[PDB]
C-alpha cells in the first residue's frame, strides 16, 4: 500500500512542477503516474499495482469520498494537505481493471494565472480588452477549448477585477484557481449542477462580479448575461473558432441576441499555443504561401523565422515552457451590436472588426511564432 | 463560533445601510464579511477561514437545513425582524476553494404597496389594468423583486379591488405588505403550516379574494389555483420577474393545468431598469433586429432611439440615472387560456399583449428606452 | 483433457479465424459451436449437452460465474493462452432449456490494433485523415453498424496517442486493449458504473485522451464527445450509415452542435463486408444484380475486380475470412463545421460534404470490393440493397 | 453477444424496456409482441414504458399473418366494399376503387359461418428514418401502416382488404384484424 504517501507526492508535485492536473493510473505490474505540466500529462513516476488502491485511498480520503466505492466513480473536494497545498483539490476516482484511477484537478492559485496582458494581447487587441473589463457591468465573451487559455484570461480578469469592494463569485467546472477578493464555486453539469444551475446559485450569493467556466446550455449564456444585467461585470467563456463567432455562437445557441446586446461590451477569441522554452528554442524558416495566408507579406516572408520547441529540462520535456494565448479582440460598437441581433456570421463580424484594426487568431498565432514565442506547428495545431 | 461576531457587526451595518446582501466569503486565510450596498460591495468585517465554515453551518441552522454538511450547497430563508434588523434573510451556501460561501441575502423590506396606477404603466397597460380588475375573479398573478415588485405589486392589486366589503386574505412569512380591510397570514412551516397549508384555509374559507405572498409549495401552487377555479380572486405572488413566465409556471409546480388555465384573468410584472440623464444623452442604436427578436411593436422596433449616459454627472456612474420603474399587464383571454395549457414561451405569451398596445415589461420597458429615457440595454437588462 | 481441449482449441481457432466472439449455443444434442467470424457466427463445431455442462461450466469457471444456476443471468473476465494465442476473454452465460449458454469474447490486445494508415484512405484524403487525427484535441468520430470493425479504428487512433507517458484513457467492457499505462476503465453498471458513469468520470478523471470502446449507453456518446467539446482528445464508437449522418448523430446523442463545430475534427462511417478469404480468393464478378443495386462506376466495373469466397476452412465454411472495414471519411472543415453549428441534417451535411470530397460509404465499399478485398454482394448487404 | 435476439413473449415493462435495450446495441430483436397489428407492434414500445432512447435505437420492421375468416369463394355474395371504408383504411387507390367485397351466404364449403375456413393476411412494415420519428412521436398504427403500405405494399389492412376485395375474405373481417 505504498501509495498512501506516494500519491501525496504526485499531488504536491503537480503543483510544484506547474501542472494543472494530478493523475495516478495503473499498469499490469505497477501504476503510471503523471503531472499535467504546462497542460500535458508527463510521466512523473510509477507506483506498485496494489499501491494504486492505496492511491485511491489517498485521493478519496483527502476529499471525503466513500473509501469503499472502488466499484463506481465518485468525486469531491479535497481538503488537501501536503507541501505547497492547502487547497480544496478537485477530486475524482474511477475503477479500472488494474485498480481505481486517482485524480485531482489542481486547484491552482491566483499566482498561476498569466495576466490579461501577459497572455499576448497585441496593443490594439489589449486596449479593447481593457475597454471591456473596465466597465462596471456587462459581458465579455472569451472563446476556445480547455487549453485555450480562456481560463487564464478569465481568471486573470479576476485578478484584475475581484477586489475587496466587489463580491466576486465564480462558477467553474471544477474550480481551477484560488483567488482572493472572490468566492470561487465548484460546478458539475453531470450531476445536474450545470452552469445554469450554478448561475442561479451565483445570483443568490448577490455578486458584483462573475466568472463562467463554460457556456454550453443557452441558459449558461443567458444567466451569465442576466448577472451582467443585474449590474454585475461578467466574464464568460465559449468554445468557438473566433471572437466573431462568440457573438454569432450565442445567437446560434439561442441566447437571445437582445440579452447578448444588452450586456455585451466585447469579445476575445482565444487559443493556447505552446511557448518555446528559451533553453530549447530552435530557429527554422516558414513557407511563403502559408505565411501569405497567415498575414506576413513579402518583406516579412523574406526574413520570416519560426522557433521550434525542441526540448529541455526547463520545459517539462514538452519543448515548450508554459503556453501563451492567441488573442482576437472585438468591441461591440453599434455596427457590431447590430450584428449580434441581426444574427450575422462569424465571418461578417470578424471582418468588420479587422477593418477597425483587430488582429485575428490566425494572424496572432503566426506573429507569435515569428516573434520567437512559438512555432507554426503548435500555432497551426492550436489555431483557426 | 464567533465567526458570528463579524457577521453580526455586519447584520447591524448591512441592515442599517439598506444592503442587498451579507457576504461571508470563503477566502484564502480569512473570511470577508461584506456589504452589498446601492448595487455594489463595500467590506466591513473579517472572520478566519475556520470561521467561514462555522458560519456555513449557522446559516444552514437558521433555515433548518443540514448544518453538518459543510461541503454541499443548501438554501431556504428566515424571518430576521429583530427591531433594527427588519429584512428576511435568504439562506444560501455555496462551496468554493476554501469552503462554502455563507449567504444571508437581504430580502429587502417590503417598501409596502404602490397604488398600481402609480407604477407609471404606459396608458395602454394601465387602462387595461383597470379593465382586468373590473372582473374581480380567478388569478391576478404578479412578479418582480422583493421590496420593489413581488408582493409589493400583488398587494397593489388588492389595494385596488379588495375593499373592506370583500373577504380578503394574504399569505406571507412574516407579513409585511399591509393593506387595511385585509387579513394577512403568517405561514408557520415549522408547525407544518406551509404556504400550502395557509392556502388550504384560504380555499376552505370561501373568500372573495385570496393572496399568496410566495407560491412556495406544490400544494401551494395547487391550492391557490384550485380556489381560483371556483372564481375566488386569487391574487398571487409568483417569485419570478416576468408575467409571461408566471403565466405557465404553476404547471412546473405540479399544478393541474385545468385549474391554472381556468383560473387566470391577468398577470403583471415590474422592473427597475436604470434611467439616463437625457440632458447629456449618448445616442445608442435602437437596433430593430434586437427589437424584432424581442417581439416589440413596430412602433418601438422602428420608431426609436436609445440613449445612454456618458457616466456622466447627470447619471451615474454606470451611465444611468437611477432606478426606472418599467411595467407589464398580460391580460388573459380565452386564447391565452389555451396558450397556458400549451405552455407557450415567455416571449410569445408576452408578444401577444404587446401587439395589442399593452406595453409589457419588454415593451413598456423598451418603449421607455426607445423613447430615449433609458437604453434598450438597461431595459433588456431587465426584460431578458 | 476433453474439457480443456475444446476450450483451448476453440479459442485458439477463434482468434486465428478472426472471430470477435466464441459461442457455445445450447441445443438438445448438439450445441452449435460458432465463431463470430467477420462479424457473424459460423459453424466451428458442435458440442453435446453433456459438454454444455462441462464446457459451459469451464466458461463460467473462467469467468467467475455461478456454476449451477439455471435460473439467473451471468457475466465475467479472464486471460487466455495456447498455441499462437495470448489474448484476454469476456465470459458470460444465460440459463437455457438446453443447458446454459456461454460466450467467450475475444478481448483483442493492444498488439492486435491497426495503424491510422490502415484505414484505407486514398493519398489526398489520407493526408487529411492523418492531419485530423494527429490533432491535440477534438473528436474523431468512428462510426458504423454492429459488424463495422469500429474497435480497431477506435483503438488505432487511441494507439496512435496511447503512450503511458500521456494520460490516455479508454472505457472497455471488460478491458481488452492493453498497453498498460493507459487507463483502461472497466465498467460496473451494477455498482453504477455504466459507460456514461465511466465517461462522466473520464471528464472528472481529466485524462488527455477520452475514448469509448462501445457506446451502448447514448449518454456515453454525449459525454465522450463532451470531452472533445471541452478540449480533450476524443476517439469514440457510434452507429452511422453515412458519415454526414454521423455528424447529425452527434447532435442527436446530446453532443452540443455548437461546440461540435469547433470540437469535431473528423468523421468516419464504416462497415464490414466479409473479406474474401485470402486462402480461396477466386476472381469472379462484379455481378449485374449487385451492380444495379449499388451504382458501381465504370472504373470500378471494368478494371477493378471482385473475388469469391470459394471456401478456405478458416472462414467457418463460408469462404469469407477477416473483417473488411469500409471507410467513409468526412474531414470536418469549415463547410461541415458551419453545417454543424447550424444543426444540419445528414442530407444537408452530406451534400456539402460530397461537394467537398466525401466519397460515400456505399461508394467506398464499391471501390474497395473491386480492389480485391471483398465481394460487392457484401457491400449490398451492409448498405443498399 | 446476439446477432439475433428473441423474446418468446414481451409480457411486461422491464422486459419491453430491456428487450429494446437488447436491440439498441445493433442486434435483431425478433419478438413475440402482444398485438394483432404490425404497426401496433411498432408503437407498443412507447406504450410499454420503454425508455424511448432504446426505442429510437431499436425498431427495424414488423411481420404479420393475422388470420381472417376466409369468404366462401364458391357462394360468395357480392357486397359492395365501401371505397370510403377502404380509403379511410388508407389503401393504395386501385385497392380502394376497383375493389369489391364478398361474404359467403352459407355453403358446402363454409357451413353456417359464411366463411371458407381462414386466410392469413400479409404484412411487412419497414422502419426507415421517417418512421423512426413517427414511432417515437407516438403515431398510430393506421399512420405507420398507411405509410409503409404505399407503393402497393401489402399490410394486414391492405393485403387483408385487398383479398377481401377479391372475395377471399370480407372487408369486415379484415377490419377486425386491423382496427
Short mmCIF file of N, CA and C in Angstrom, two decimals, chain C residues 148-200:
data_model
loop_
_atom_site.label_atom_id
_atom_site.label_comp_id
_atom_site.label_asym_id
_atom_site.label_seq_id
_atom_site.Cartn_x
_atom_site.Cartn_y
_atom_site.Cartn_z
N UNK C 148 -19.02 -3.53 -37.86
CA UNK C 148 -18.26 -2.50 -38.59
C UNK C 148 -16.74 -2.47 -38.31
N UNK C 149 -16.26 -3.23 -37.32
CA UNK C 149 -14.82 -3.22 -37.00
C UNK C 149 -14.38 -1.93 -36.30
N UNK C 150 -15.34 -1.24 -35.70
CA UNK C 150 -15.09 0.03 -35.06
C UNK C 150 -14.05 -0.05 -33.97
N UNK C 151 -13.93 -1.17 -33.25
CA UNK C 151 -12.95 -1.16 -32.18
C UNK C 151 -11.54 -1.12 -32.74
N UNK C 152 -11.34 -1.54 -33.98
CA UNK C 152 -10.00 -1.42 -34.50
C UNK C 152 -9.69 0.00 -34.84
N UNK C 153 -10.60 0.65 -35.52
CA UNK C 153 -10.33 2.03 -35.91
C UNK C 153 -10.24 2.90 -34.67
N UNK C 154 -11.16 2.68 -33.74
CA UNK C 154 -11.23 3.42 -32.50
C UNK C 154 -9.94 3.25 -31.77
N UNK C 155 -9.48 2.04 -31.64
CA UNK C 155 -8.25 1.87 -30.95
C UNK C 155 -7.02 2.14 -31.82
N UNK C 156 -7.13 2.22 -33.16
CA UNK C 156 -5.94 2.53 -33.97
C UNK C 156 -5.52 3.96 -33.69
N UNK C 157 -6.51 4.80 -33.41
CA UNK C 157 -6.18 6.17 -33.11
C UNK C 157 -5.80 6.23 -31.64
N UNK C 158 -6.53 5.51 -30.76
CA UNK C 158 -6.14 5.54 -29.35
C UNK C 158 -4.68 5.17 -29.31
N UNK C 159 -4.33 4.09 -30.01
CA UNK C 159 -2.98 3.56 -30.05
C UNK C 159 -2.01 4.61 -30.53
N UNK C 160 -2.38 5.37 -31.57
CA UNK C 160 -1.52 6.44 -32.07
C UNK C 160 -1.10 7.32 -30.91
N UNK C 161 -2.07 7.67 -30.08
CA UNK C 161 -1.85 8.53 -28.94
C UNK C 161 -1.64 7.79 -27.59
N UNK C 162 -1.83 6.47 -27.56
CA UNK C 162 -1.79 5.66 -26.34
C UNK C 162 -0.45 5.35 -25.79
N UNK C 163 0.26 6.36 -25.41
CA UNK C 163 1.51 6.12 -24.75
C UNK C 163 1.21 6.30 -23.29
N UNK C 164 1.77 5.47 -22.41
CA UNK C 164 1.69 5.64 -20.98
C UNK C 164 2.20 6.99 -20.51
N UNK C 165 3.03 7.65 -21.32
CA UNK C 165 3.57 8.94 -20.95
C UNK C 165 2.46 9.97 -20.79
N UNK C 166 1.41 9.81 -21.59
CA UNK C 166 0.30 10.73 -21.65
C UNK C 166 -0.88 10.05 -21.02
N UNK C 167 -1.81 10.81 -20.53
CA UNK C 167 -2.91 10.15 -19.92
C UNK C 167 -3.94 9.75 -20.89
N UNK C 168 -3.74 8.57 -21.37
CA UNK C 168 -4.62 8.00 -22.32
C UNK C 168 -5.65 7.24 -21.55
N UNK C 169 -6.92 7.49 -21.82
CA UNK C 169 -7.95 6.79 -21.09
C UNK C 169 -9.10 6.32 -21.97
N UNK C 170 -9.45 5.05 -21.78
CA UNK C 170 -10.48 4.41 -22.57
C UNK C 170 -11.42 3.54 -21.73
N UNK C 171 -12.69 3.47 -22.16
CA UNK C 171 -13.68 2.61 -21.48
C UNK C 171 -13.83 1.32 -22.22
N UNK C 172 -13.67 0.24 -21.48
CA UNK C 172 -13.79 -1.07 -22.03
C UNK C 172 -14.79 -1.89 -21.19
N UNK C 173 -15.26 -2.99 -21.76
CA UNK C 173 -16.26 -3.82 -21.12
C UNK C 173 -16.12 -5.29 -21.45
N UNK C 174 -15.21 -6.01 -20.80
CA UNK C 174 -14.16 -5.66 -19.87
C UNK C 174 -12.95 -5.21 -20.63
N UNK C 175 -11.88 -4.90 -19.93
CA UNK C 175 -10.66 -4.48 -20.60
C UNK C 175 -10.02 -5.47 -21.53
N UNK C 176 -9.64 -4.96 -22.70
CA UNK C 176 -9.02 -5.74 -23.73
C UNK C 176 -7.74 -5.13 -24.33
N UNK C 177 -7.75 -3.84 -24.67
CA UNK C 177 -6.64 -3.29 -25.45
C UNK C 177 -5.46 -2.74 -24.64
N UNK C 178 -4.77 -3.63 -23.92
CA UNK C 178 -3.64 -3.24 -23.06
C UNK C 178 -2.28 -3.69 -23.61
N UNK C 179 -1.42 -2.71 -24.00
CA UNK C 179 -0.99 -1.46 -23.33
C UNK C 179 -1.47 -1.09 -21.94
N UNK C 180 -0.77 -1.50 -20.90
CA UNK C 180 -0.92 -0.99 -19.56
C UNK C 180 -0.34 0.39 -19.54
N UNK C 181 -0.70 1.23 -18.58
CA UNK C 181 -0.07 2.55 -18.55
C UNK C 181 -0.99 3.58 -19.08
N UNK C 182 -2.08 3.11 -19.64
CA UNK C 182 -3.11 3.98 -20.11
C UNK C 182 -4.27 3.51 -19.27
N UNK C 183 -5.19 4.38 -18.97
CA UNK C 183 -6.31 3.95 -18.19
C UNK C 183 -7.21 3.09 -18.97
N UNK C 184 -7.56 1.96 -18.40
CA UNK C 184 -8.43 1.04 -19.07
C UNK C 184 -9.62 0.73 -18.16
N UNK C 185 -10.57 1.64 -18.20
CA UNK C 185 -11.71 1.59 -17.31
C UNK C 185 -12.60 0.45 -17.59
N UNK C 186 -12.99 -0.23 -16.53
CA UNK C 186 -13.81 -1.40 -16.70
C UNK C 186 -15.16 -1.15 -16.08
N UNK C 187 -16.16 -1.12 -16.93
CA UNK C 187 -17.48 -0.79 -16.43
C UNK C 187 -18.03 -1.80 -15.44
N UNK C 188 -18.86 -1.28 -14.56
CA UNK C 188 -19.51 -1.99 -13.47
C UNK C 188 -20.85 -1.32 -13.16
N UNK C 189 -21.84 -1.42 -14.07
CA UNK C 189 -23.14 -0.77 -14.01
C UNK C 189 -23.94 -1.24 -12.82
N UNK C 190 -23.57 -2.41 -12.28
CA UNK C 190 -24.22 -2.94 -11.09
C UNK C 190 -23.90 -2.04 -9.91
N UNK C 191 -22.69 -1.48 -9.92
CA UNK C 191 -22.25 -0.56 -8.89
C UNK C 191 -22.78 0.82 -9.20
N UNK C 192 -22.96 1.06 -10.49
CA UNK C 192 -23.43 2.32 -11.03
C UNK C 192 -22.53 2.77 -12.16
N UNK C 193 -21.46 2.03 -12.38
CA UNK C 193 -20.54 2.37 -13.44
C UNK C 193 -20.92 1.91 -14.81
N UNK C 194 -21.80 2.67 -15.43
CA UNK C 194 -22.25 2.40 -16.78
C UNK C 194 -21.21 3.05 -17.66
N UNK C 195 -21.34 2.98 -18.97
CA UNK C 195 -20.33 3.66 -19.77
C UNK C 195 -20.48 5.16 -19.61
N UNK C 196 -21.67 5.62 -19.25
CA UNK C 196 -21.86 7.04 -19.13
C UNK C 196 -21.27 7.46 -17.82
N UNK C 197 -21.50 6.66 -16.78
CA UNK C 197 -20.91 6.95 -15.48
C UNK C 197 -19.40 6.97 -15.64
N UNK C 198 -18.90 6.02 -16.44
CA UNK C 198 -17.48 5.95 -16.70
C UNK C 198 -17.02 7.19 -17.39
N UNK C 199 -17.72 7.66 -18.41
CA UNK C 199 -17.22 8.86 -19.04
C UNK C 199 -17.43 10.07 -18.20
N UNK C 200 -18.46 10.05 -17.39
CA UNK C 200 -18.73 11.13 -16.50
C UNK C 200 -17.47 11.26 -15.69
#
